[PDB]
Amino acid sequence: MREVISIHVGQGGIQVGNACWELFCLEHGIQPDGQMPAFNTFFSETGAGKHVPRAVFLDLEPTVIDEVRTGTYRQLFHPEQLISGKEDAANNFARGHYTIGKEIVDLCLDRIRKLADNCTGLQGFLVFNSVGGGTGSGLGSLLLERLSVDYGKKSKLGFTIYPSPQVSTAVVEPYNSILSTHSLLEHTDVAVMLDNEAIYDICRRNLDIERPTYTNLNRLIAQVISSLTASLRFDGALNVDITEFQTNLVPYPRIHFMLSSYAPIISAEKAYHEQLSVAEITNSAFEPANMMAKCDPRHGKYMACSMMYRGDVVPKDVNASIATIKTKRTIQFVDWCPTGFKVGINYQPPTVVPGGDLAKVMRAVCMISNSTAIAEVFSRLDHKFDLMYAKRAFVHWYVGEGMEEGEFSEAREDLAALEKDYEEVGIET
Amino acid sequence: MREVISIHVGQGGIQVGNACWELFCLEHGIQPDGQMPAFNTFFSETGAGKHVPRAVFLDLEPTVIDEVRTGTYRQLFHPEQLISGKEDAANNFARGHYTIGKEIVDLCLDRIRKLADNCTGLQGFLVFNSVGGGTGSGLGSLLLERLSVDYGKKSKLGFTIYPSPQVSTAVVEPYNSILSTHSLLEHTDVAVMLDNEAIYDICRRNLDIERPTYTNLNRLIAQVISSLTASLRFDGALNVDITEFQTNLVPYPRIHFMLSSYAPIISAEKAYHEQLSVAEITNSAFEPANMMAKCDPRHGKYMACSMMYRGDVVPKDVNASIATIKTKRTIQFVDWCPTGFKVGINYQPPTVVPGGDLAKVMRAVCMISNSTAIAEVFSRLDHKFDLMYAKRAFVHWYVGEGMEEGEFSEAREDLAALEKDYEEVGIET
Amino acid sequence: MREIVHIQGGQCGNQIGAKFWEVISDEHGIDPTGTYHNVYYNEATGGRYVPRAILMDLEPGTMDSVRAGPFGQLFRPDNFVFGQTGAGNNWAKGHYTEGAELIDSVLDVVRKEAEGCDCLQGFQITHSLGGGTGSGMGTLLISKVREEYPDRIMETFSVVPSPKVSDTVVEPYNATLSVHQLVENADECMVIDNEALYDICFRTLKLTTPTYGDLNHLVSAAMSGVTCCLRFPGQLNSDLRKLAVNLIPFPRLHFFMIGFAPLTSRGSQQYRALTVPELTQQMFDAKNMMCAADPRHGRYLTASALFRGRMSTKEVDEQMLNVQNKNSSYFVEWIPNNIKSSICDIPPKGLKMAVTFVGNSTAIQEMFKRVAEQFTAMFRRKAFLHWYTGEGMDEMEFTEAESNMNDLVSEYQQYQDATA
Amino acid sequence: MREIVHIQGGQCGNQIGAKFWEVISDEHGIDPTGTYHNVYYNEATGGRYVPRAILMDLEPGTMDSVRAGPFGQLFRPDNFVFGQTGAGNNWAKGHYTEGAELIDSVLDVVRKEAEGCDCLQGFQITHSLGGGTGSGMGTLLISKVREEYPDRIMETFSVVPSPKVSDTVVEPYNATLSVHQLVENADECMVIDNEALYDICFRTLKLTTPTYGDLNHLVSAAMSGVTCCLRFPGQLNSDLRKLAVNLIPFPRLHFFMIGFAPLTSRGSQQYRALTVPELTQQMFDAKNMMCAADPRHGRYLTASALFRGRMSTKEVDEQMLNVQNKNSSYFVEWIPNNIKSSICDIPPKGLKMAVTFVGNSTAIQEMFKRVAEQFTAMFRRKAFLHWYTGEGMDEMEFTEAESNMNDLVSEYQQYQDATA
Amino acid sequence: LKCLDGEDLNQGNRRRLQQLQQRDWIEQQIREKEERKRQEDEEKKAFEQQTLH
Ligand SMILES: Nc1nc2c(ncn2[C@@H]2O[C@H](COP(=O)(O)OP(=O)(O)OP(=O)(O)O)[C@@H](O)[C@H]2O)c(=O)[nH]1
Ligand SMILES: Nc1nc2c(ncn2[C@@H]2O[C@H](COP(=O)(O)OP(=O)(O)OP(=O)(O)O)[C@@H](O)[C@H]2O)c(=O)[nH]1
Ligand SMILES: Nc1nc2c(ncn2[C@@H]2O[C@H](COP(=O)(O)OP(=O)(O)O)[C@@H](O)[C@H]2O)c(=O)[nH]1
Ligand SMILES: Nc1nc2c(ncn2[C@@H]2O[C@H](COP(=O)(O)OP(=O)(O)O)[C@@H](O)[C@H]2O)c(=O)[nH]1
Ligand SMILES: [Mg+2]
Ligand SMILES: [Mg+2]
């Protein structure tokens, strides 16, 4: 009577979803080919032997879907969930949201309707996508719109890979990343900011590797997602359903942009020389050098923190360490929210993916913080946007596909107002 | 329920720290490969079997800090407790004190904060810096500033190595030893002057070893510091504490510069042919010959004397020796301190490091003398400063790092204040 | 004769009720197969015993918490009102949207188990005041049953939001929105707070790893003791209505404090001396109770002491008189002999004497400020308010409730320091 | 009846307390496990006997001393109130800043151990006057309890620092700060110094290596002999208030010297017998006492002598008359028959006669005079003063405190030359 | 209620057992990591030889 749909769109979304399904099929004893030698949430009995995962993979460039169809888990999925287009995204918006995306959105909605009928105790969605791309934003925006006008009450869990400050893999990512906000606000309930440069540095210092790769990023994001859904999937002294998120992290439905953090991200040799109890782990969890987003909360405030402790952890130690961390001076909460820490416990430790660099440890804490510092990120992005739109750069590639140019400023209008709203909630009464 | 953090900056500091941790790991039988086949003040159980020491080792020069990273202790320390830069500092203060160290002190102070919030009853710090070393003096002064502005109430007991009055191992030391004076004076409550020529004479006239080297001096200093921490470490018929060590040797908060002495430094031949009575060991712990900081205390005056023994002693004998010492004439006290002797006993005789010329001895005495003859040292050192700053020699190396030379006169006047203060209090009422 | 039904709601309430049923089976000597080895249990074909406890909750997961644990086979499957969603920390779910969908069935089952009796002495609920499910569902249920049987009393062993160590963020809203009704239609609202429970578990027993099972064990033992002067004979018996008469001067000061004795660690127990004076001195202290309101910061309007075992009644009564005359300031003067006693003739299993202290004091008012103050800093900015605003609430429903809370606490003051 | 709570404090205080308790146990025939083999001890379930004593220290190390050393299993695991920081030989620390955080709990436990008594004859303390923890915390507790229980007495077995044999350097500050309070809230401050103990264990017993345990044992023997005439029957009984009246003729002249008899070396033990002539000739000796002050440099206002064992009282009284009428100068004239006796019926373990000589003399003004000097220098240069200022205490106190000191000795000196 | 098993009596055993298990897993992971690193180095050497040929 519990399940979630995991829609994976774009390119980064589908790869992090591949890694996520690796981790899931692992920890539930499922074999990658589908058979089996606590899973009604993600996987499901098919009707003949195997088990199929609740997921649909949309994409236009057939390369990644073909790699999945000929990779290791070829028998896992259902050959309909893998919706592969015919053209590419070309890193713009109207070619995934106005012209071509309409050729796939209806088939997507039919498949999603099938997945919904095949389920009973629905709880929400888990969309993964980059926004710095062309189809992860456009088709993602269209799909969000169709769902919000089709299903309604069920809350969506966006996981959007934004552009980091320095590292850059496309020159037009500010444009479409700003274009996607016009639809991220309205339809999406929870949006978890994930950058890459922060995860790069995280893999550098903690995991001691010096040649990290996208696969490692995806492994870590899969770990965070599994620790997110452990409460639905497994036991726990203090369980946290997926409604506790919306009723604990969303002061106003227009300010719901959270950012992640995870611990302990330690290599093998660096845990040998490390105590790593609950106190140390909840001290490390707040270190901005461990956040999964380029933001320094020292220049912001915290509204709420959902902390899920998986593994053998007693509650009284959590309460005491929470008291300590809230008593610190450099981590200040807002006055209009004096009690902020929503803590849950699960009696299962992490389950390391085989062949990974991470070290397996009896305890782990996953923090998801609704804060006010992330606002500056948006501001930064607008900066970039302006320095292009001041000279009308690349507007032709968008106007060529029916995209009425008057939306652009409107986006930088609406998003701009968004920033003021953060300036409305940092007001110490 | 009691711990102590040790910091080792500079080259000589990290060397004497290597020797000191060798002696410690031998004292509690902790094997130099970490795992063990009275320690919670120093070591900590690292969550899996073995132990880690409570200390950080800072040095911009990666020579010696890497030499340890590959030496016979790389399995003991934690690889994050070993901080290295990219080059040296080259003996000038402002190099490793304003520009370069500015980045490394952040990571250092972070490590120190992690250690602090990992310990329970931290009592004090124990820094080390050969003030002649540019990186040593500079980075140590920066750390002292940042800790005194961060921690506050906790105490700090430096153990610095000065340039000898007559012999020297560099030409610009009298510069970068004056600049550290204000830092070590205003942000540190204790200080213990050490100097090689004194220890060299001690070795050459007690142990008969004719050609000593640094490592012998460092082993002996390790012995002194172990006899210091013995009270907090082990049992004791009459114990002392750092919290009592400070408030029994600091008559005024700005005259706390104490010299040290130790006995008995004897080899095997001078051990077997020796009665080794408490009276003789105490009457030898006063001879200006074996004072571990070059001066003539007879021509000066004493203010306070801590006498921390170890081994089997008879308090009757200790007090009788104290009396017959106060009877003497060459060593006279100030008027304003009638009871000038604090003593302390422990219950673990000295340890012996295979690789050292010291002989196993049932008893031992470590004396910390807060006196006024120590001012003489500064005088001579001050002398050198004149004969340099008169002609601005080498000042351009300083100004070539952002430090305007005007700070020189400020530090010189600050030290002249002490040079005048000491020669003032040493009078009657 | 003088029977009781046991409604449980919310995760905390259901877990504490499970613990309480294990303790009751431990006392009356019933192994989990429901056989002997009418006040609480009920007979069934074959000499089986089934407890008259209806278990309700919005999320079904708690089933695997009440059936899996030991002694979980005593209950009957027809007494499980388990929905499918889970109000999820939201009050309005269990009171306006989802509440009214299972309230009908739970009303049916409680009526079925009520008519099966002959002398319904009263109800006693176990739930929380912070969680949406517990608060909302239990409050709606209490409302409807006080609208149904206005003559029988209804005790609630309802915990309160912890003063300092909080675990949720929407706490004060639920706390106030449930107090606004528990002040109206309750009789014995025994309040319990996790902070004081940890205080006891860390200073009175010197334990090291308190799991929720231990706090539940403690509060359930106190729950047993408070009414264990009825199941057994007594040199001076008592019941629920005696407490309800001797413990509330005015019809709205009905929020009590609970304490238990004796409590000793390993060493202390190896050295402690168990005599009525020592139990008294341990009982009337500050941190031997389950309410983070230091009783010296107030005065006891009244307080009952239920002793159990074989003691000397003169010693008990003389000790009551002595402790009232000794700390005469900490009590209240305009009610003479403001301390009440009661004595049962049988101690718990494994003991030889034990006391349960139930004090209606004016000290709890501090609590009803701090939590209330929390609300004032979370409602003056509409923080998280759109959720409750969306499910059918109204701003008045909040504000007046707050005022009511204020009113309530002010009442204590208004008639704490009064005399003639 | 006439119970006595024995508070301890400080390192030396705790050592002397453990020694005193093991001596009392080996007297009353109490094995180190607490079984026979109310004035001091207290009953415990199963027939155990726990000592009615409270330990205290600002550092926890001393804990694992008293539990380690023999006769540690007796003390109750609750009375071990302790701190972490440690006053660290700084009076302000252990009297205003840190110890003041624990004084509340120490008062609570003392109030719990004083309400459980029928007739509390008084208190008794044992603590150094130089150590921060001991002096500071003890004297604050003294002020508290003497503003609590005015009708009862407050005895302190303080151990003043002998100036010659010194162990600390900031000692005179603590000494004067403790004497300024003990002159105001105490009744019998029998002082002890280590010089006299070294001399005794070095000359009158011919020991070789006097361990601190041994001098502690000597002080424990004196302390046990002080009040023995109350715990056992006697042809001439005594207590801690007959003593408190036959001695102090002025509300502030309450500083006593102790003396034990008989003490003889092991090698000379089989030699000269033990009868009241030898006990008298050994008792009044200047260097037989436990105070570095030659009575030849003064006189006695009063001298009590508590004999233990069994003897013809007429011989005792005849020897008293003889020693007074031959040593008439040492006894001041304006008080007639200034010497007092009290004979019990049970000697200690081993011996058959015993003498506890307690003298309130005017010859211990020196034991402050010299200390006065030890202050006046170390103050007028403000030596180590800043360690006392930075903790809240203002310099002013020291000044006025020294005043009292002078006033004190001034008073003494007057009674040395008020002839009649 | 005289004694409650909810307190942990054998905390030392829990601590030591967890320590030993953690050391075991750390050893296994160290070994597999060294193996992987050496295999990567040998593959790089193979590419070196191909290019030289
Ligand atoms: N963390 C993470 N980010 C990825 C991954 N793969 C791609 N990305 C991000 O995707 C962005 C590249 O643009 P795309 O996502 O490929 O553009 P698109 O909208 O998907 O259009 P197509 O490339 O045609 O599918 C970059 O910002 C990447 O950071 C991945 O595996 N892990
Ligand atoms: N007693 C003792 N002194 C040492 C030892 N090693 C170095 N010293 C002293 O260190 C001082 C020189 O300063 P260093 O800190 O070594 O030079 P540095 O660290 O390279 O500083 P930069 O050149 O600026 O980078 C000299 O006075 C040495 O006598 C040792 O092992 N024992
Ligand atoms: N003393 C005690 N308190 C608990 C326990 N379980 C939960 N609590 C608290 O009770 C509150 C939640 O109440 P709950 O029964 O879960 O209702 P719900 O949140 O609406 O489902 C939270 O503040 C929990 O911390 C327990 O087992 N013992
Ligand atoms: N006669 C005797 N004196 C002691 C003994 N131990 C300590 N002393 C003295 O007690 C003084 C220390 O004071 P103390 O209050 O115990 O130290 P603190 O606990 O740190 O405050 C020192 O002068 C010690 O010499 C002992 O065993 N016997
Ligand atoms: Mg695309
Ligand atoms: Mg260097």
PDB file of C-alpha atoms and ligand atoms in Angstrom, chain B residues 10-12 59-61 64 87-91 133-136, ligand 6:
ATOM      1  CA  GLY B  10      57.570  24.693  12.654  1.00  0.00           C
ATOM      2  CA  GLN B  11      60.450  22.353  11.978  1.00  0.00           C
ATOM      3  CA  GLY B  12      62.035  21.978  15.413  1.00  0.00           C
ATOM      4  CA  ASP B  59      54.360  22.819   8.539  1.00  0.00           C
ATOM      5  CA  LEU B  60      54.406  24.580   5.190  1.00  0.00           C
ATOM      6  CA  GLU B  61      57.619  22.770   4.250  1.00  0.00           C
ATOM      7  CA  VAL B  64      59.603  16.557   7.525  1.00  0.00           C
ATOM      8  CA  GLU B  87      57.079  25.405   0.005  1.00  0.00           C
ATOM      9  CA  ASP B  88      58.992  26.801   2.972  1.00  0.00           C
ATOM     10  CA  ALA B  89      58.790  30.270   4.515  1.00  0.00           C
ATOM     11  CA  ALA B  90      62.517  31.161   4.598  1.00  0.00           C
ATOM     12  CA  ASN B  91      62.896  32.528   8.105  1.00  0.00           C
ATOM     13  CA  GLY B 133      61.807  29.439  11.920  1.00  0.00           C
ATOM     14  CA  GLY B 134      59.849  31.873   9.788  1.00  0.00           C
ATOM     15  CA  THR B 135      57.109  29.324   9.199  1.00  0.00           C
ATOM     16  CA  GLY B 136      57.310  28.221  12.826  1.00  0.00           C
TER      17      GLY B 136
HETATM   18 MG    MG F   6      60.297  25.852   7.674  1.00  0.00          MG
END
